[PDB]
Amino acid sequence: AMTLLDGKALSAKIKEELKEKNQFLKSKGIESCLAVILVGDNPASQTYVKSKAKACEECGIKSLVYHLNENITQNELLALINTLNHDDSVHGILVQLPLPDHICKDLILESIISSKDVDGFHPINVGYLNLGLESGFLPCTPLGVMKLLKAYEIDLEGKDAVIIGASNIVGRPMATMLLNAGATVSVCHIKTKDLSLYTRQADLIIVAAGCVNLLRSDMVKEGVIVVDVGINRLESGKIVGDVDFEEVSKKSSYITPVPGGVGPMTIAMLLENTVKSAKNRL
Amino acid sequence: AMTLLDGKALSAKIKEELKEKNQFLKSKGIESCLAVILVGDNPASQTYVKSKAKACEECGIKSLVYHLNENITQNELLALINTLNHDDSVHGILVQLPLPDHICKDLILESIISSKDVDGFHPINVGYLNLGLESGFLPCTPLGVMKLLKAYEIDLEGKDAVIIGASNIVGRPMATMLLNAGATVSVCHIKTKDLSLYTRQADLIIVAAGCVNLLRSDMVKEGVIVVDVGINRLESGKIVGDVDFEEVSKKSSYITPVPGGVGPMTIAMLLENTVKSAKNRL
Ligand SMILES: [Cl-]
Ligand SMILES: [K+]
């Protein structure tokens, strides 16, 4: 039996739950508010910001989008975040990546007040998660994967999990959450000698490589759980992930489709982290 | 052709380097100082603290030992740490583990100011390492292994590494440093279904699980590099590690002995992190 991990349906349910929560919060004087900072006119990044703003409106979160020029200085971005850090009506601060070459990503993300770091990228929020303390802000993409697996009651302790990709956005916090859940984790990347050596043994595979058809049926055992984080656009217009879905799904017990899988869960956790920040301010 | 990873020999060379650094720092008015907080009367902890204070004296580090009552309250311990936090003459603050049962270790370690956290346990220093940055302090035990492996010119890029144990002291920061160095890392523990599936393919094994003879010769391939962090006392009083040394060393290209391996390297990094903090005053 194979089951699709329908992140699209789960994300819509979470949005409906947050809309109800925000109505109760609004009736008590708290209007959940997320500030999104976009530096530049990148067409893809503008699409991501519109998706977040549209998702905020659907669950009652007030959106503050700052479209800044590509040529703005690092000090001007720091000044805006400092103003947002002390704005009590703002509960979440998200900086859309990537930033221009003349603006240091590490300095900008650390300047966000950790109590509004809904992306979970501040060093102290990374440290909290790595210490097994899942109380603070968790990165949205791996958190959405965990919430999607929990929605199907996927028991994770003892499972052999393989993480393909070791980025701060997905890979590293993903392996930490799985490790916190009692699973055995293997972190692979572009320097791994034999990727199929690890994937052939895995009970759970999370692919965040950004490569079309990286995961094939050859490298998969029967009953594997496959989580596809990739969002790749074919030149034929079709959106696909990092997994050969048509063949890998035939050997999978659970698998995320693309589109409709991890994508919507990443946005839902952003809204959830925002409402969490607003609810912790009563 | 097994080669012993002589941590005792490398540690003595590091202390000689620190002795020259402290003579220079003292000439600039900087007397490197480490404060050690010992709570209770655990006989093993007393021995470790004396060993630390002795190692400080050998390389020109001023040691301050604070011996607190076993029944000290949590806020009383926090008050001392706050005093040491604002003491400009103190460059490093270490809390000897284990603390009494009525003391929350995580809350105590987070109260240490991160610029004097020579153990690298503060959440923001854990975050810096997990983000791939070396701006903070690194935990002494995994840092010592990295320095020990570097001294023997062992290339870690692309190597299949397996870490057994996932503690905040050793296992988790070790996997991050190996991942930052470009190795493929697998974190195993008590919930792993079959440790041998991971260890038999490993080029490098870090064992820190607190169990005698956990790593056997038949769980290992020829040419493996073995690092034994375990310090276990048998019924006879003999100190051994987590590795069956007699059998595993026959298949190992490099292996740490116990004693004389990771142990002295852990203390050497404590001293080195303290001189590193004192150098920041320059
Ligand atoms: Cl602007
Ligand atoms: K790859």
Curated annotation (Swiss-Prot), chains A, B:
Q: What biological function has been recorded for the protein in this entry? A: Catalyzes the oxidation of 5,10-methylenetetrahydrofolate to 5,10-methenyltetrahydrofolate and then the hydrolysis of 5,10-methenyltetrahydrofolate to 10-formyltetrahydrofolate.
What family does the database annotate?
Belongs to the tetrahydrofolate dehydrogenase/cyclohydrolase family.
- Entry's PANTHER family? C-1-TETRAHYDROFOLATE SYNTHASE, CYTOPLASMIC, C-1-TETRAHYDROFOLATE SYNTHASE, CYTOPLASMIC-RELATED
What is the protein's name according to its record? Bifunctional protein FolD
- Print the keywords alphabetically: Amino-acid biosynthesis, Histidine biosynthesis, Hydrolase, Methionine biosynthesis, Multifunctional enzyme, NADP, One-carbon metabolism, Oxidoreductase, Purine biosynthesis
Q: Name one GO biological process term.
A: L-histidine biosynthetic process
Question: What does the record note on quaternary structure?
Answer: Homodimer.
For this protein, the record's InterPro entries field holds:
Aminoacid_DH-like_N_sf, NAD(P)-bd_dom_sf, THF_DH/CycHdrlase, THF_DH/CycHdrlase_cat_dom, THF_DH/CycHdrlase_CS, THF_DH/CycHdrlase_NAD-bd_dom
A GO cellular component annotation here is: cytosol
Q: Does the keyword Amino-acid biosynthesis apply?
A: yes
One matching Pfam family, short form? THF_DHG_CYH
Q: Which organism is it from?
A: Campylobacter jejuni subsp. jejuni serotype O:2 (strain ATCC 700819 / NCTC 11168)
PROSITE patterns found in the cross-reference section = THF_DHG_CYH_1 (PS00766), THF_DHG_CYH_2 (PS00767)
Give the EC number(s) listed in the UniProt record.
1.5.1.5, 3.5.4.9
Q: Which reaction does it catalyse?
A: (6R)-5,10-methylene-5,6,7,8-tetrahydrofolate + NADP(+) = (6R)-5,10-methenyltetrahydrofolate + NADPH; (6R)-5,10-methenyltetrahydrofolate + H2O = (6R)-10-formyltetrahydrofolate + H(+)
- Molecular function terms from GO: methenyltetrahydrofolate cyclohydrolase activity; methylenetetrahydrofolate dehydrogenase (NADP+) activity
Record pathway: One-carbon metabolism; tetrahydrofolate interconversion
**Residues annotated as binding NADP(+):** 165-167, 190, 231
